[PDB]
Amino acid sequence: TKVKRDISAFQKVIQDISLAVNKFNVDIERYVGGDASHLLADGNVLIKATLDGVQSLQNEPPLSSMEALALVGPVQDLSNQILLAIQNLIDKKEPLVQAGFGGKVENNLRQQEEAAQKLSELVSTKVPHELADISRQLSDGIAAGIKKGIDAFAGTGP
Ligand SMILES: CCCCC/C=C\C/C=C\C/C=C\C/C=C\CCCC(=O)O
Ligand SMILES: CCCCC/C=C\C/C=C\C/C=C\C/C=C\CCCC(=O)O
C-alpha cells in the first residue's frame, strides 16, 4: 500500500536511544582511566531514553509487516551499537575498577537491564508475527549482553 502510517513515534525512540548509545560509545572508546562520572552520566541518559520509549510507545497500535520492514535496518543498527557498547565497557573494566567505579558501573548496568526488559516486553507486543522471531533474538542478544556486563563488574566496587 502507498498509505504511509505515521510511525514517527517509533523512529523517535530509535533515534533517542541511538544518540545516547553512540555518545556512550564515543566516551568509552576514548576512556583510558580516571574519573568515570561522565560515563555514568552517559549511562543515565541511555536509561532515560529507554524508559521514555516505553512511555511513548505504550499506546501505539501494532506495526504491520510493511511498517515493521522500514524499521528493521534502524533496529538492527541500534542492536549492533548496543552490543558494541557493552563490549567496549567490558574492555575498559581495568581502568574503571582502578578508578573505584566498578560498583557504580554494576549498579548502572542493573538499571539498564531493568529498563531494557521493560522496553523489550513492550516491543514484543508491537512487532508483527513475521518479524517476531528475529525481534526476540535481537532482544535476547541485548539482554544477554547486559548480563555479561553485570557479571564482569559484579563485586568490583570499593
Ligand atoms: C526486527 C525489527 C522488528 C520491528 C521493530 C519494532 C519496534 C522497534 C521500535 C522501538 C524499540 C526501540 C529500540 C530497539 C532497541 C534495540 C533492538 C531491538 C530488537 C528488537 O526487539 O526488535
Ligand atoms: C556505566 C554503564 C553504562 C553502560 C551503557 C552501555 C550499554 C547498556 C546496554 C543496553 C541498554 C541500551 C539500550 C536499550 C534499548 C532497547 C531495550 C531493548 C528493547 C528490545 O530489545 O526490544
Hey, where are the domains in the chain?
1-158
Of the candidates 78, 145, 150, the one whose C-alpha atom is nearest the C-alpha of residue 110 is 150
Largest interatomic CA distance in the chain? 59
Is the CB of 41 inside a 6 Å radius of any atom of ligand 2?
A: no
Is the CB of 47 inside a 6 Å radius of any atom of ligand 2?
A: no
Is the CB of 14 inside a 6 Å radius of any atom of ligand 2?
A: no
